[PDB]
């Protein structure tokens, strides 16, 4: 009696397909670097060529560089010189490239690679052999009796599975503790002499009033400076437009001085028509039009700056001489909502010190003057709305990855006629889900930019949190909660009716009747996605951006100024934590996803090390991102414990004593995760001053 269950799974077919994809993409890179010239290195050289003083250039001492950049970017030239004779690294190859941020990257990366290695010893040599010996399924089936389906209900081995899950959450906590023991994070919150104050009445146009209030409230306190904020979004836009016009004017002036006047067409649709008729599009001088537009933009910028003084916001900045009085101000002002009246002065009635909420002012570079205007308590209701919209869109978008698995026949009594083709049944949903996961962070970034929150530190934290949470949701739970579909509803009434069916039917998990979908996804995602990451996936973004506004030839030089894209650590941690979460979720269940998880980790390291040294422009990382990424890493096995609880309740029962360890660990695991989190904040507090 055979109706479903794919023998040997889709693993071999997707394996040959992804190795073909990998060799194809590596050949495509090589041919792009050999035929499209220095596409991926000239932009990097231009970006680091003193961008602070790139528009204007002066001949200084030793103008010709001493091959500092040439020495590094001259090793990988041959086609075969990409893998061997290239690392010689032994934990010291690239420490002095990006700073301490790159140092913590692989610090955690390895605390992962060796972590998944120490997982590959018992999860391949203990749980896999004892799950293979299960015989509740059919012997003839392969990859169906190697997963958690094969362990029988009436057996003392699901206890081993759950206990192993608990001890593996413990060992992951130990690994992350070893990682945290060597964080020694840089003190990002330097003792700032300037504070940020909100809700300040706009009628106090004199900073002397605020200075007098601070002096009277705090004896012995000196106010260095007082700063006020203004609506400068239009000012910023006008400045950007003027900068673009000025750069284009210089480019066209140089072109005119070199090869004479150049005639261009201002209309964007001129390039669309190949018509050479004079009446179709009027031709105007490039430099004259550029100068006129720049003059008009400068006049509008001057008018906006003149009107800026009238648009005073309620956010102010006060600078003090000593940070001790700043700490006193913060300690007095943090608990205002608790009913304590802070220190007052003679002009406090105008000041209204009971309204002010003062915290440590972020760095001005971290401060974006355009998006500090995003502050209201009409918040947290748009957030639920945008979150619901994104969740519904992602559900309706990932539904095809589930419905492509079709539905069994159950109509005629002769299933010998034909069966499903493994290619589109297994590889296609996997690659399609991979494409959706790859395109997800773009939409997540767009949503976060729409929200814009309060400060960019919180913005990056909410990115690295919400992108990860949506990804693990869409990749673990609802792809399986909706994969409980194809439910057997026929002569066999409930799940365990032996009426006209063998033990192949298992309502607990019958996703492709074995669970091969997720391992198929992880292997294809590994190989294809890191083939894309070798080509960096940012090339498609650049292509789309140029196709959006392909015009105004000096804009090509403008693009080349910022053609080199820096590291987007949010996306890379999103990928790593997504696959880590899915592996930890199905590690104990199906142990075949473990060695392929090792393959993903090792090959991801292989690609991003080369990216680090030759395609990832160095740039510092905020410590909060890593301090949250470790928290996601430790919280990931709660997904696996939740899946173990799910399998206890469905397959085993409710009051069965095992359902309770999964029931208990999930409780002990969450309480221990909270303990570890608040211990991490406590250690930060210790290593804060």
Author numbering: 26 to 714
Paper text:
The TMEM63 family proteins (A, B, and C), calcium-permeable channels in animals that are preferentially activated by hypo-osmolality, have been implicated in various physiological functions. TMEM63s, together with its plant orthologues OSCAs, are members of a newly identified OSCA/TMEM63 cation channel family that are activated by mechanical forces of osmolality. TMEM63 has three members, TMEM63A, B and C in most animals including mouse and human. TMEM63C is essential for maintaining the kidney filtration barrier integrity in zebrafish, and expresses low in chronic kidney disease patients.
Using single-particle cryo-EM, we determined the structure of TMEM63C at 3.56 Å resolution as a monomer. TMEM63C contains 11 transmembrane helices (TMs), TM0-TM10. The N-terminus is oriented towards the extracellular space, while the C-terminus faces the cytosol. Between TM2 and TM3, there is a long cytosolic domain mainly formed by α-helices. Similar to OSCA, the ion-passing pore of TMEM63C is surrounded by TM3-7. The results show that TMEM63C is in closed state with two restriction sites, the radii of which is smaller than 1 Å. Three bulky pore-facing residues (F542, F543 and Y546 on TM6), highly conserved among TMEM63 and OSCA, have been proposed to play critical roles in channel activities. Particularly, the short α-helix located at the cytoplasmic side of TM6 (TM6b) swung to TM4 to avoid the clash with TM0, the intracellular half of which moved close to TM6, compared to that in OSCA. The movement of TM6b may narrow the ion-passing pore of TMEM63C for calcium entrance. Additionally, we identified two non-protein densities within our cryo-EM map of TMEM63C, which are likely composed of lipids, and may contribute to the modulation of mechanosensitive ion channels gating.
